[PDB]
Amino acid sequence: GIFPNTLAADVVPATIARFSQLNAEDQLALIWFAYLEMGKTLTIAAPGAASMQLAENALKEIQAMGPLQQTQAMCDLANRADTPLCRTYASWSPNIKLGFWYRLGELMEQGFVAPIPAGYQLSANANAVLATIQGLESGQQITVLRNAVVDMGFTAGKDGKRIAEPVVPASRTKVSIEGVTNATVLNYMDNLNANDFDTLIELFTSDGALQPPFQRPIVGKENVLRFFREECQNLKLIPERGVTEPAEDGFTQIKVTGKVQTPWFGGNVGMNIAWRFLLNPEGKIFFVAIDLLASPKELL
Amino acid sequence: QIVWQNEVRRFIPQEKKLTAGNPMNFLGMARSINPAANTIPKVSAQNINIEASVPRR
Amino acid sequence: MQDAITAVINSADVQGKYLDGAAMDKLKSYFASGELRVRAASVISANAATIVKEAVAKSLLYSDVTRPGGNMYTTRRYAACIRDLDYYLRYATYAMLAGDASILDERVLNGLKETYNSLGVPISSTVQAIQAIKEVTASLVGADAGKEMGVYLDYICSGLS
Amino acid sequence: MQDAITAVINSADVQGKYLDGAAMDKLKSYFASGELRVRAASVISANAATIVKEAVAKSLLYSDVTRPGGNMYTTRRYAACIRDLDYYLRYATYAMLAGDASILDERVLNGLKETYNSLGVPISSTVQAIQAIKEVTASLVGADAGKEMGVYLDYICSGLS
Amino acid sequence: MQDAITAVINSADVQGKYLDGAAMDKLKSYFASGELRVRAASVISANAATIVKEAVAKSLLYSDVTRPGGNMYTTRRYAACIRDLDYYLRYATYAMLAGDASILDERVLNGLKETYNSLGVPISSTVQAIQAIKEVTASLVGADAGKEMGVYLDYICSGLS
Amino acid sequence: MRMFRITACVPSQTRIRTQRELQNTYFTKLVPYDNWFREQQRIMKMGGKIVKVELATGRPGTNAGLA
Amino acid sequence: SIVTKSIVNADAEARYLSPGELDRIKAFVTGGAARLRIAETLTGSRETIVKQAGDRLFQKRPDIVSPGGNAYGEEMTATCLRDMDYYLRLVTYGVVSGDVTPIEEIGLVGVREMYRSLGTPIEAVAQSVREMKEVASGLMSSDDAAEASAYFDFVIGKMS
Amino acid sequence: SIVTKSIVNADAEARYLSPGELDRIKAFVTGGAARLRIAETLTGSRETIVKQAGDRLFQKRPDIVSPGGNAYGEEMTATCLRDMDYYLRLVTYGVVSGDVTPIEEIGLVGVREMYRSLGTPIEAVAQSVREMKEVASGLMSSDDAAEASAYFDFVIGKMS
Amino acid sequence: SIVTKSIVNADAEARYLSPGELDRIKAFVTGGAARLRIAETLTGSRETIVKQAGDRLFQKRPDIVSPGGNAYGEEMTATCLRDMDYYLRLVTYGVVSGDVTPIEEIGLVGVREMYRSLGTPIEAVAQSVREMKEVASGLMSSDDAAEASAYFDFVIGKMS
Amino acid sequence: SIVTKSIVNADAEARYLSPGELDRIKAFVTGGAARLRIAETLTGSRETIVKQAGDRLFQKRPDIVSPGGNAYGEEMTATCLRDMDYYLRLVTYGVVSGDVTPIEEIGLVGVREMYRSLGTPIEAVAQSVREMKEVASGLMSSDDAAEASAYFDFVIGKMS
Ligand SMILES: *[C@H](C)[C@H]1/C(=C/c2[nH]c(/C=C3N=C(/C=C4\NC(=O)C(CC)=C4C)C(C)=C\3CCC(=O)O)c(CCC(=O)O)c2C)NC(=O)[C@@H]1C
Ligand SMILES: *[C@H](C)[C@H]1/C(=C/c2[nH]c(/C=C3N=C(/C=C4\NC(=O)C(CC)=C4C)C(C)=C\3CCC(=O)O)c(CCC(=O)O)c2C)NC(=O)[C@@H]1C
Numbered sequence A: 001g002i003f004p005n006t007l008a009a010d011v012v013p014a015t016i017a018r019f020s021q022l023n024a025e026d027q028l029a030l031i032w033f034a035y036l037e038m039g040k041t042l043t044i045a046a047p048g049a050a051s052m053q054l055a056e057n058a059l060k061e062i063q064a065m066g067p068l069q070q071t072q073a074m075c076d077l078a079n080r081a082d083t084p085l086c087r088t089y090a091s092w093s094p095n096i097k098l099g100f101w102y103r104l105g106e107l108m109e110q111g112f113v114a115p116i117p118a119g120y121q122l123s124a125n126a127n128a129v130l131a132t133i134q135g136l137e138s139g140q141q142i143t144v145l146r147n148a149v150v151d152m153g154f155t156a157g158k159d160g161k162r163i164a165e166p167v168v169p170a171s172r173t174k175v176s177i178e179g180v181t182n183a184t185v186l187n188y189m190d191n192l193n194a195n196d197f198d199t200l201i202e203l204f205t206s207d208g209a210l211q212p213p214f215q216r217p218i219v220g221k222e223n224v225l226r227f228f229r230e231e232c233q234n235l236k237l238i239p240e241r242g243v244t245e246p247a248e249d250g251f252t253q254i255k256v257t258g259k260v261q262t263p264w265f266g267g268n269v270g271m272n273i274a275w276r277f278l279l280n281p282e283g284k285i286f287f288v289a290i291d292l293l294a295s296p297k298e299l300l
Numbered sequence B: 001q002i003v004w005q006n007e008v009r010r011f012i013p014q015e016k017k018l019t020a021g022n023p024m025n026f027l028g029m030a031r032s033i034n035p036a037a038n039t040i041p042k043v044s045a046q047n048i049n050i051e052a053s054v055p056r057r
Numbered sequence C, D, E: 001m002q003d004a005i006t007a008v009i010n011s012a013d014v015q016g017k018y019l020d021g022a023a024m025d026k027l028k029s030y031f032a033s034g035e036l037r038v039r040a041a042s043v044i045s046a047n048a049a050t051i052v053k054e055a056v057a058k059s060l061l062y063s064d065v066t067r068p069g070g071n072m073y074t075t076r077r078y079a080a081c082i083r084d085l086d087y088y089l090r091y092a093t094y095a096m097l098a099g100d101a102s103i104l105d106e107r108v109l110n111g112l113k114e115t116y117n118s119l120g121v122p123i124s125s126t127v128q129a130i131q132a133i134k135e136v137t138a139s140l141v142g143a144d145a146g147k148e149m150g151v152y153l154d155y156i157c158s159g160l161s
Numbered sequence F: 001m002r003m004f005r006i007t008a009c010v011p012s013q014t015r016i017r018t019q020r021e022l023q024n025t026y027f028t029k030l031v032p033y034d035n036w037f038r039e040q041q042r043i044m045k046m047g048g049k050i051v052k053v054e055l056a057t058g059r060p061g062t063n064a065g066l067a
Numbered sequence G, H, I, J: 001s002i003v004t005k006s007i008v009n010a011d012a013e014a015r016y017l018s019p020g021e022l023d024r025i026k027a028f029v030t031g032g033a034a035r036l037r038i039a040e041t042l043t044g045s046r047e048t049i050v051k052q053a054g055d056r057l058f059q060k061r062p063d064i065v066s067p068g069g070n071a072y073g074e075e076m077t078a079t080c081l082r083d084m085d086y087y088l089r090l091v092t093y094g095v096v097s098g099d100v101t102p103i104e105e106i107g108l109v110g111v112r113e114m115y116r117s118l119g120t121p122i123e124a125v126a127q128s129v130r131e132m133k134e135v136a137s138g139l140m141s142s143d144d145a146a147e148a149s150a151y152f153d154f155v156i157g158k159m160s
């Protein structure tokens, strides 16, 4: 690609050398914090000036990857390990690599990618390097970022990264919901996330009825099985708060509000799902209504 | 007068020497003439009246 | 030129035989791969210039080839090299669509080695550029279609070198 | 001529650099393939006469070429065709061992087309015979070494054409 | 083709360097000699047909070439010989004006020897004709312009030989 | 340079063409002065009828400057 | 050069050089001293012209060195200046030769294709050429720079 | 028009419409309802798609809207979005007709010359059309998005 | 290499390679890891080896850098260091190839004539190569040092 | 032998052995133990190996022992077995020497002429040697059998 600076003293080559001296963890944290500082103390990314189509397939694969494997792939790129994604990254231009990392950071901010571990703090050396980068000029900043990030990925004939990075060791945990502490709805949320609908729907009453958004209620246990297995397929929910009270016939009326990060009837990620649960007194959900409350975004 | 130990220390590989067409020759000049970029002009397409704001002549 | 269908038909005709089970199986395999071939061809046609640009940047730019004294020095020579890479990509797409390298032999590789030898075009540099094109096309198209395009681009490389 | 080692060495030397990781990987690949190359060379040396015999029987015999008026009619002309096939097989083995089709280019192809054009030798039929030799060698050596031998046999055919 | 200015420019460009002192010196030398070349070109253009006429008369008239059975016997063959002489005069004048011999190689010498060998044309006779053309042009053009013209005509003769 | 705008109708005589041939059957073209004689000769030899000829460029009797 | 162009035209017409062509060659030969002076000035001050023209071009069209621009970054700016240096050298060659054939052959034929592939604004390149022309004309005398700017104008017109 | 293209090809070969071509015309006319639904959606949602695509384009290529760029200034941005709307309407025309010929006729032939004269970056225009295609794919079904992707990619490739 | 030499001999005799050559080729191919490792050692130590060898050579022989010496002067001394680096690279090539043929063909044929025309003392060049061999042996283990010193002493003997 | 061939090549080049040639000589010296082991195995099992080889050849091609064949009668069978033993001893000599040079110079040069003089079927002799190779491979270790198979194949090819 473009000629990378290696050793000319000055300031930019010195900064690039310091970044190289920093280990894999320091380099990855430094690039993440630089992306965080982008637009305020660093140059704004302009992905339109690079052929992002080449990295589009890798980006989609990463997005489809689960968060654990997402972090594993990113750390593999940082460590320059031998992986197909590392090969694909190494087979890119510096601009494409920088745009790919920018897209990864944007997806991490939007939640589509597994984010940085919470409460992480940049090391002293990495923070000093980041301060030097901020002191640098805009063109100097972009040159430093490009040269620092080009070396990542796996390339034949090159092998280092002795420090290495063994990453860091939701659905399995209880769904964090405010004001709702009922085993029936908790199991419903967990089973819906796990997509094991055959075991999920036992929480439904025999006369259980489901109310999909924009559609009339569906009644019948096997009808709800069919609805789950044909419409609600592999979607992730993020319930936020909830209220519970009694209701006529001994029922339990529970209104839960949360966010769905998975494509489900539109308003992707930015739709508030309201679960209206008229649960039977014995516990099984007699009526479940899924209401896709929308933001000012329209055209649903 | 000339000292050879200095150049023995200052030896450089031949393949590392810059040639005529290399942009690294002008890298130093570009560093000297520090170009000032444009501050990003935050603009929202949503707040733009296409029919009226387009020029008429 | 011959596609896979025409190749199978010619193989049957040479022996004067009707299309038997094996020929039908080969035709079925080609028909199965047809959708992937069409999708890859459309993707390459869309990203034609981008693929060549990325390949030349990866393999040729910032080198003795582009610097004075290199083959890709003058603007005319740069344009000629870009045109040659465009022709290679387009004819590789044709070969991938047809499932056969007959078009590559008939309209590209015939006398191409002699042409570069007379012109002074660096064969190794051109082969590296085509390898870069193959990698870019693989990353831009996928795994199976990328593999097929790599097969035909390596066919061109073998013919050239 | 040039083998893989000398080829990579010359490629590094012409631009004046030492051997980097990329070149060393090529040499490692050649060293990995050396055992297979030696085994294939031994097998072909053992079965040199049989390979040419089977190829001639499979492509040329009982055709127009051997009948009176054909280019393989006289016994001398038949022996000349056999000798040409012997050259092609032996030099294909040489190139397979060396990992580089440079001995073929500098000792089998540079002017051979002109000689056949002067002598009236049918280039298409000799290409068919070389293809038959490729098939027999592949059947006798295995797919992995058969493909490598066929690479240089096809190189010879393309040079002839 | 290329003149002396083109040669200096091409050397500087291929080295990727600006016109240094030596290139300026050579350009100054060519500019100094330019008026001479223009005068010689004007003289030869004015007297194009005549010089050919006395060249043939001193070289080829009443000789075995012009007798029956020679290559210049028939009227059509005489016309062809005259056309050859006019080409050689025109292109030697062009080379004289340009200060370079690249034009003769590009246009005349690139295939002319094979042309005469296929035609049966007597290259010894044509060398004698151009050698006589040397003095015939020198008489009209002077001594130093004559030296330059003789240089280019010797170029043509050596290419023929 | 002097140009001739010529309209002519050239029929086919040997074969019954099944492709659209009106464009070269009846047409008008701008032929150069230096080519007009040979173009006219070709049309006559093919058997065409010269419907019209005009001097689109230049003026008649131009001793110099006709380029 | 002018010699080669006249020879090419004469041979295309299949004729020796006309009095007009010969007079043009002789006039170019007589005036070559001023051409060499122009080339000497341009080569001697080439770093100055390139530096000042790059500064003026970046000032006039700052989006080139802005983020997302082609000349963004130190390396991109260096390559920008390198292309400017090629164009200045080609201008010098054309000035020396008296014809813009070398400029056309080396850095004008296919320049559209090359810069389109590279992602560069050809109008920005023409603006850079104009800046170099202004700096050089300031560096040279009136008539000398006046007839030196013709080749700069040719390059600007052919690129824009 | 797919029918018009079939007629043109049949006339070029001097033959009646092939059975396969007639079958293709039949299938297109049968699916015309679904095909025209996409055009209806695009016409209804023209404003939001154009504005969102323009904002994303400015995010990707801030240099064009930066000072010294073609789109810098309120009026320049307005006319850039106006051309965006033109190309969206042309894409709707193409999806309705089943053929890229109307797109190539009204808004694609001579576009290089027009934007070179205006100073516009054709690469930026292609990127903007890419953003429009992505937004339309988001706003439409997967099958309809894929169908319109053919016309959008045709415009993208012809742009660059 | 041994492969090239054996193939050349077989071609000259117009025969296939004998098993006595094939097994040698197999052994050479198998024992390539150590040669490669010595290669990376020398290439990594190239700068230090060249510097130390040149320093030791100039200390031992002052006339080379003395006034009137072949290497007298800045550019002359740098060029002598360049020659040392050349021969180190050739030695690395030979070590990797397991043969001295690449060294002989690249920088060993006509070396006497070349340096005689240059005026350089070939004996001093051999002394420089000897110092380089000593440094390489110091930087290498006992077995690897001997193996590399084989090529080094071949080069030294061929030089003088 | 490999050693004598390397010495001959070095003498022809008029030079000492290269480092690669010395390494190959050392490798052959190291493998001499295994070569001697294979020779010991063959010499120990000389009688049985020739017995099974002769029986297999007789079964494969009965026309030799049939009336009118060259090896008809007890004396002819004894001569055939003696030739078998001679060729097996030659194979052992070649395996010990590390190259087929002793085999070629003892019982492989002029073999076709000698069998043409004696009327013996050269193809029959080659098949007999192939049977010997098969029985030896069955009798000895795979690695030793693989090493001796090259020499056996060389002998059979030379007799083909
Ligand atoms: C019969 C006495 C012996 C015999 C004959 C035999 N020959 C073949 C095949 C071929 N014979 C020839 C020979 C010639 N062709 C020529 O043009 C000349 C000179 C005019 C000669 C001597 C050739 C070329 C062939 C190849 C086939 C072809 O003709 O195209 C066979 C068949 C071999 C096979 O397997 O196909 C046979 C049987 N065989 C005997 O056993 C007798 C001693
Ligand atoms: C006589 C009717 C006219 C005439 C004649 C004349 N001719 C020449 C010289 C030559 N004439 C020819 C012609 C031919 N040679 C051939 O072989 C053929 C066909 C068989 C033809 C037509 C040639 C070739 C010459 C050159 C001399 C030579 O051949 O050796 C001259 C003398 C020219 C001179 O200056 O030497 C003359 C006078 N002159 C008239 O006035 C008559 C109209």
Ligand SMILES: *[C@H](C)[C@H]1/C(=C/c2[nH]c(/C=C3N=C(/C=C4\NC(=O)C(CC)=C4C)C(C)=C\3CCC(=O)O)c(CCC(=O)O)c2C)NC(=O)[C@@H]1C
Pocket (backbone or CB within 6 Å): F011, F012, F013, F017, F019, F020, F021, F022, F023, F025
């Ligand atoms: C038949 C109903 C009438 C008739 C026919 C007739 N036609 C011609 C000659 C020509 N006809 C055409 C017409 C066309 N050519 C085209 O390409 C198309 C458009 C797609 C049309 C309509 C032309 C151009 C000619 C010129 C000759 C040629 O076909 O190339 C003739 C005379 C042919 C000749 O050479 O003499 C005739 C007889 N004649 C009648 O009386 C009917 C009323």
Ligand SMILES: CCC1=C(C)/C(=C/C2=NC(=C\c3[nH]c(/C=C4\NC(=O)[C@H](C)[C@H]4CC)c(C)c3CCC(=O)O)/C(CCC(=O)O)=C2C)NC1=O
Pocket (backbone or CB within 6 Å): A002, C061, C062, C063, C066, C067, C073, C074, C075, C078, G064, G069, G070, G071, G076, G077, G079, G080, G081, G083, G084, G086, G087, G106, G107, G111, G114, G118, G119, G120, G121, G122, G124, G125, G128
């Ligand atoms: C002698 C004739 C000739 C020309 C014309 C030429 C042009 C040229 N400019 C290049 C790159 C480049 N050229 C520029 C320059 C510019 N950026 C801008 O915004 C400006 C408009 C413009 C300068 C005024 C840039 C930025 C690149 C890098 C492109 C990239 O890396 O993507 C390259 C490819 C990289 C390389 O130089 O190896 C070439 C061949 N080379 C030649 O041999």
Ligand SMILES: CC1=C(/C=C/C(C)=C/C=C/C(C)=C/C=C/C=C(C)/C=C/C=C(C)/C=C/C2=C(C)C(=O)CCC2(C)C)C(C)(C)CCC1=O
Pocket (backbone or CB within 6 Å): A024, A025, A026, A028, A029, A031, A032, A033, A034, A035, A038, A043, A044, A045, A046, A047, A048, A049, A050, A071, A074, A075, A094, A095, A096, A098, A099, A101, A102, A104, A105, A108, A115, A116, A117, A120, A142, A145, A166, A167, A168, G066, G067, G068, G069, G072
């Ligand atoms: C302007 C402009 C551009 C430039 C654009 C630019 C400058 C683009 C650059 C954008 C930047 C700076 C992107 C960096 C992103 C960093 C990421 C994704 C790191 C995440 C770290 C992780 C997940 C690790 C977390 C961690 C875990 C998990 C651990 O296990 C341990 C700790 C740790 C913290 C390491 C272009 C090039 C596009 C075009 C030209 C142009 O002009």
